[PDB]
Design a protein around this ligand. Structure first.
Ligand SMILES: O=c1[nH]c(=O)c2[nH+]cn([C@@H]3O[C@H](COP(=O)(O)O)[C@@H](O)[C@H]3O)c2[nH]1
Ligand SMILES: O=c1[nH]c(=O)c2[nH+]cn([C@@H]3O[C@H](COP(=O)(O)O)[C@@H](O)[C@H]3O)c2[nH]1
Ligand SMILES: O=c1[nH]c(=O)c2[nH+]cn([C@@H]3O[C@H](COP(=O)(O)O)[C@@H](O)[C@H]3O)c2[nH]1
Ligand SMILES: O=c1[nH]c(=O)c2[nH+]cn([C@@H]3O[C@H](COP(=O)(O)O)[C@@H](O)[C@H]3O)c2[nH]1
Ligand SMILES: COc1c(C)c2c(c(O)c1C/C=C(\C)CCC(=O)O)C(=O)OC2
Ligand SMILES: COc1c(C)c2c(c(O)c1C/C=C(\C)CCC(=O)O)C(=O)OC2
Ligand SMILES: COc1c(C)c2c(c(O)c1C/C=C(\C)CCC(=O)O)C(=O)OC2
Ligand SMILES: COc1c(C)c2c(c(O)c1C/C=C(\C)CCC(=O)O)C(=O)OC2
Ligand SMILES: [K+]
Ligand SMILES: [K+]
Ligand SMILES: [K+]
Ligand SMILES: [K+]
Lengths: 351, 351, 351, 351
């Protein structure tokens, strides 16, 4: 077997050490744009988010309303694919034709929207998604280091060339990243086990601390860029517990962040608002729970998250803190933060 | 005194990082066969389990019914030796003559069965066990790094040659493994302290994290194979808390796993089913407890484990998860898993 | 991004190993004097505290009474600047003209007093503070690694030369220290996150274990002294939970210590004494709390600390323990302690 | 300041890895003798304990009855010196003249007994102790790395030469050991902070994990023996929580062990037996508590320990476990254990 010199770590084990803050760095001047899909050196990505946040490919998170609400703030949602092909297409179509600011839109002023796909019914699902107007796709899986993802991406490239963007994952190391990059992925998703509704131990026992995973994949991605001139955006998916974890994920090299629990709390998530002993909550279940697969064990859990109100106010408060921290680190942009951030590990006792 | 460069670790401190999963790797195609006794290079073991699980040499675990139930699924039980020689022989005989699938049987279609022996009355116990039809024996001890085990194995070899298979242990490092290998053991059992009914601290203070023990013994075993051409199967005994710990133990090099608590929960264990406030439990006590030795201190404990029903359904669910994880690691067989597994240590905080 | 070879640590992770205690080292002979502002090699500081303790630049800690009570024992208070310029000046003036022992006074026998200032209204606030008689100033900020502090210090030097002393901070590493030193700071304050009313995680996620911060800044400060002949006193601000943490902070190189919670408990702090179910408490809130800024988030908290009585008796008990420990380390003075202290890290388990 | 490459550890962080157990190693054949005072190479110590246990120099532990009860089993007690010179002498005299097995006696068949002394009234106390018949003395202090201990030992050597044996301490590193060795100590006591009634943190903040302290002092002691031919026995004082900690302390190099709490639980300790809600307890307070010094702070605590009955049965049970573990390590004697023990550190998570 193969072992490692250091144990893996989660975002909670890190802190940012301030850098020189210049007079021109104020939150309002911080630019949170970031690339969504791959491009060659000297070019810009064909799709740039206004904010580095995307909602998870989950039944309890990314519905029609979530996609519109998030696109309006500059991010993008990946409509869950764990439903009928026609149901998913309808949601995508409803978002693209909603208008029939930092809004994320296409050349027709229509909100951008993503859609999750699987390695099984993609021959029928992809065409429907494209026809419906999906701006980008993403293969949704707990272990993307699979020949099935290579086959899926390959089929897409053979029928649509580079006109259809498709993200792949999830992986947690340089090898997995490399495999999906050579396969043609437009962006690679990082993370196995970090999620909130994730009980890694009581499951398969596969995974890696999110911080270690991002740091390792980012180094491979940068190495890959130097060898081929191809820059592949990476997404840190899961493991975000506090707002500052967002800044950490970006500082470590992630171009954008995928969140489930965070967005599930909003009015715009597709779940039921439930009042439990004076507290308003929202339903939240993992895609691995039996509650979701049904569309003696269980890959995820079914629980509740506290109601936080509308997405807008919460995302604004979260990103204001990110912007402020970025200025503490001497960064006016995400690339500058990734370049200048001073990140330290914290001792067990400190926690 | 002699010290080590690194502290020891338990299975809970590790996670598996996925490898390339090929299209041909599906749980149903995973082969869980594994060697039970030693063989020379170029040969196959004379006894191969269909599944890498064996039930512990304990009064509260391996009785007649357990041995039959486990053999039927492909594993083997070691009838406890902490009873009269005639009582143990009767159980062994009852298993071998029960018939008077992935079943583990001999050339006569009879279920395979093991039997534990001690370093004291082996001159009278072994013959009775052999005569009764025991397929394999195993010296049961908390510290197998003993001249007594060498003497016991030697006596067996002098009277039966290599016709009678005998496992030895337990040990936790390369030196202990080496001593038992040169002594002639057919398989060596790893583990001191890991057990569930083990309170190492409040005992002698001897032991080692199970993961570190297995990793160290496996390296010595591989070194031993290269020097002599003799492959000695090793057994990871104790310390298995979750199903994924099984995959970890195998990935680290253990050929098979010995479990006590896990099997004690089944209908087939020889203990009393007790209902405590709406919960059906099963009795479980260590071989070191006064409750067992009686056949001011105490080497083990006497407690309860939750009833899990029949062995079949539980073992199947456990091994399906192992098989699935193996495919995540790109392995269709145990040897392939031991060769390809990527194993990472996890930080204290992560736990 | 930039990473570090070791994780950061807090004061609770360290212990002092005794050195040779000579017959002449008794608590009563221990000298606790220490420099407040910078000086050149071969010289002495223009201001030396009699005891290495200063009260925090906070509304709930450093008022008129605190400043008088602390100066009387040999330390100094920094009147909080989070109030009107005229209100702060009045407090400073009241302290300087209170008389209209180990007392800390100027050549006119008047108690010494400090005053906090900010990087915004300093052009109007400084003159008022100087005119009122403030002996030393200090820029109060969560991240002193800022061009704004450079600008503020520069303005002071252009209008008052080296006649007005001004401390800067807070910083946590050699780079931050270096930036403020070159900027002209008379003393540099260390610490971000350590404070008691600090919830670093649920904030920006910036900071560093106080011990690691002090050790790193002290090494840079000593390096700076060797290169330029300028000795800049450093202050360990926050993170002091127990009396022995004081000895640790000094042993690690800090010239003096800034405390908030510690002093808030005294009769002389400007907050309300509140009786909660038989326990007399004192109010205490951070400068980052909304309760203080008002002069959807929050940089600090608003809580209670147990009443400890008058400052005198408590400070005396605290420093007697420091003096005693110093003798255990073979030190009669702070510089001798910084030179001879043997400091060991403690394992996680030990805690 | 001076730092260390590794953090310190306590006994709870270690486990013993078994060695080869030979047929001749059975508990009954294990020899637990050990040297009490220093000797030259090629010689034997003038005083050898039959068992490596000595009771602490405390008011709540070592009285007349304890000294007799322990000597009868082969150990020795150090009558507490925190009492009048005439009271301590009376106890010593009562023990030496009690008779007016593994018993520890002098050439006159009288029980051996020790007596604690301090660095202040030794000119009057020592003579009284010698005259009373004390077999060995020991300077009792929280920090023995003091010129006062050198002066005390020197005075004893000037008036009695090498006829009066005197132990010194406590120290926790090679430097402290070395200082007391050159000063003439007959044995050196290790340990600061480890004790049960020790709240190191809420005190001076001086100390070191007991295991690290013993390991470091033992290496210095062995180095000292090689340079001078003088073997100085060392005592691991405090930090013993479980029986196996005894085996660890010895394996690490300590010749004998000093215990307070352990012995306080016995019928023979000089404290009151108190029944608290069905549980019989014994009083136990540290020598640093105000309750003891009286013969605003506090170096120790005043609590209760569970009644364990007579010393005999408990010590026998404890040492049987030590002997058994020694055989697991292939040792028939303490020196053999110190030479052959395989000691591993355990991970934080394991605990
Ligand atoms: O262990 C898991 N069991 C599940 O059932 C599950 N469903 C989703 N996911 C993954 O978790 C991410 C969302 O995580 P958060 O709620 O932490 O933001 C998502 O983006 C996915 O990567 C799961 N992980
Ligand atoms: O500390 C111990 N005290 C005992 O009384 C005891 N009895 C058995 N064993 C050992 O534990 C293994 C079973 O462990 P699990 O229940 O964890 O599977 C078994 O296979 C044995 O190796 C003991 N260990
Ligand atoms: O996280 C924080 N939120 C706040 O609201 C706050 N107010 C003050 N400070 C800083 O804490 C120091 C006082 O700390 P102690 O109470 O621990 O002595 C002070 O000296 C400051 O450095 C804050 N830190
Ligand atoms: O922190 C302390 N405060 C006290 O008041 C105290 N009194 C004794 N000792 C020391 O502790 C040893 C006994 O420890 P145990 O009870 O752990 O065996 C003793 O042998 C001493 O080394 C003290 N340590
Ligand atoms: C697919 O959604 C996920 C993702 C992205 C992740 C995990 C996970 O459990 C699920 C749900 C698991 C499902 C629906 C079962 C199918 C499968 O195995 O892919 C995880 O642990 O890391 C990432
Ligand atoms: C023999 O069964 C075991 C085994 C295999 C192990 C342990 C143990 O305590 C017992 C019971 C201990 C008994 C019956 C006392 C005799 C003896 O000492 O052998 C353990 O700690 O690691 C492995
Ligand atoms: C200024 O007082 C502090 C100091 C010294 C520190 C911290 C802090 O939160 C505050 C309050 C934060 C305020 C008033 C908001 C303005 C700002 O950001 O400066 C901290 O974390 O380390 C040091
Ligand atoms: C003297 O008995 C001890 C010993 C041996 C130790 C400690 C201790 O606190 C006391 C009591 C402390 C007293 C009586 C105050 C006088 C002094 O300081 O010596 C400890 O921490 O390590 C070892
Ligand atoms: K900054
Ligand atoms: K895979
Ligand atoms: K000393
Ligand atoms: K052994």
């Amino acid at each position: 077997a193969k072992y490692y010199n250091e144990p893996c770590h989660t975002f909670n084990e890190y802190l940012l050490i301030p850098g020189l803050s210049t007079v021109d760095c104020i939150p309002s001047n911080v630019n949170l744009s970031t690339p969504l899909v791959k491009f060659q050196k000297g070019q810009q990505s064909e799709i740039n988010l206004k904010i580095p946040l995307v909602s998870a490919i989950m039944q309890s998170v990314s519905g029609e309303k979530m996609a519109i609400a998030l696109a309006r703030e500059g991010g993008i949602s990946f409509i869950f694919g764990s439903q009928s092909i026609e149901s998913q297409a309808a949601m995508v179509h409803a978002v693209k034709n909603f208008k029939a600011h930092n809004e994320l839109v296409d050349s027709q002023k229509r909100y951008l929207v993503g859609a999750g796909i699987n390695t099984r019914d993609f021959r029928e699902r992809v065409p429907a998604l494209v026809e419906a107007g999906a701006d980008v796709l993403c293969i949704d899986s707990s272990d993307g280091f699979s020949e099935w993802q290579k086959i899926t991406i390959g089929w897409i490239r053979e029928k649509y060339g580079d006109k259809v963007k498709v993200g792949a994952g999830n992986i947690v190391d340089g090898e997995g990243f490399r495999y999906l990059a050579d396969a043609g992925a437009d962006f690679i998703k990082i993370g196995i086990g970090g999620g909130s509704i994730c009980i890694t131990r009581e499951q398969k026992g596969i995974g890696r601390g999110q911080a270690t995973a991002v740091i390792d994949v980012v180094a491979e991605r940068n190495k890959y860029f130097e060898e081929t001139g191809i820059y592949i955006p990476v997404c840190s998916d899961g493991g975000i517990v506090y707002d500052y974890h967002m800044t950490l994920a970006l500082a470590m090299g992630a171009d954008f962040i995928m969140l489930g629990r965070y967005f599930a709390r909003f009015e715009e998530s597709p779940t039921r608002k439930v009042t439990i002993n004076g507290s308003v909550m929202k339903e939240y279940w993992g895609e691995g729970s039996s509650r979701a697969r049904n569309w003696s064990f269980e890959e995820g859990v079914d629980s509740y998250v506290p109601y936080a109100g509308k997405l807008k106010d919460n995302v604004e408060a979260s990103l204001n803190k990110v912007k402020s921290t970025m200025c503490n680190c001497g960064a006016l942009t995400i690339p500058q933060l990734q370049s200048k951030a001073k990140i330290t590990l914290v001792s067990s006792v400190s926690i």
